[PDB]
Structure 1
Amino acid sequence: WLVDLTTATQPSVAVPRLTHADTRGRPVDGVLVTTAAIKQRLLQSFLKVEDTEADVPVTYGEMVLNGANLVTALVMGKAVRSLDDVGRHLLDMQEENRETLDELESAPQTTRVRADLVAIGDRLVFLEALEKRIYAATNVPYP
């Protein structure tokens, strides 16, 4: 059953920015947020561990309305995400879609966090339970 929580869902699109990879190797493609009780009895006697992976601490990039946007922003009311390249490239193909410069620029700095990965058959799936982490001790219910 627990493989079928995975692998019945289609992936959407990749980005070379989002580097969620295991320590020295394999990338991550799952999340699986459960409660602490269900996290407990599952990994105790059903699954395996390959923990403490490497992900980005830097929060993901920046969109600013700079001179490419800002001119188009107030004067016409038009806004284009990253008008720099898609203005440049579409000026150059004018002098001779497939826009593969969606997001692959720098691959910013990663660090090392306490992360729990499991091997659900094929996939390297992340798994964390979070009540004591960020839902603890408030008047907000857990989802």
Structure 2
Amino acid sequence: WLVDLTTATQPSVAVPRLTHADTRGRPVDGVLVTTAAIKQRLLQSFLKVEDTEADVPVTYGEMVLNGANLVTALVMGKAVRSLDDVGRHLLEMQEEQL
């Protein structure tokens, strides 16, 4: 019956940056979560604990930002340079994201 749980789910799309693993380094494919009343039961007769300490990532993730970059720029005087600053402040701003 346990073997049915494990095989009922089709694997998922995501591939994580790091992978929870053994001491040996073998990867870990998923998580049973039960009450403790059952866990005690299973660990006697129906299973064996083949590792004790596991390796787990620490840092969270972050995101890469490619956004819509908008401007509202105060302006004093109207000329090409003052206007080209718009084009300039764009590049300045898009230069910042990278």
TM-score by length of 1: 0.41
Provide structure 1 residue ranges, at least 5 long, that are not aligned to the other structure: 97-143
Contact 1:21 1:53 in 2 (8 A): no
Which of structures 1 and 2 has the bigger CA Rg?
2
Provide structure 2 residue ranges, at least 5 long, that are not aligned to the other structure: none
- Structure 1 residues 11 and 91: alpha-carbon distance in aligned structure 2, compared to 1, 3 A threshold: farther
Q: If each structure's strand is expressed as a fraction of its own residues, which one has the higher value?
A: 1
Tell me the number of residue pairs that the alignment of Structure 1 and Structure 2 aligns. 96
Distance 1:84 1:27 in 2: 55
Q: CA deviation at 1:59?
A: 3.6
Q: CA deviation at 1:18?
A: 3.3
Who is 1:79 aligned against? 79
Distance 1:79 1:39 in 2: 76
Q: CA deviation at 1:23?
A: 1.1
List, as ranges, runs of 4+ consecutive aligned residues in structure 1 with deviation greater than 2 Å. Answer: 51-57, 63-96
Contact 1:69 1:83 in 2 (8 A): no
- Structure 1 residues 34 and 73: alpha-carbon distance in aligned structure 2, compared to 1, 3 A threshold: farther
* Aligned residues: CA RMSD: 10.8
Who is 2:45 aligned against? 45
Contact 2:69 2:93 in 1 (8 A): no
Q: If each structure's helix is expressed as a fraction of its own residues, which one has the higher value?
A: 2
TM-score by length of 2: 0.57
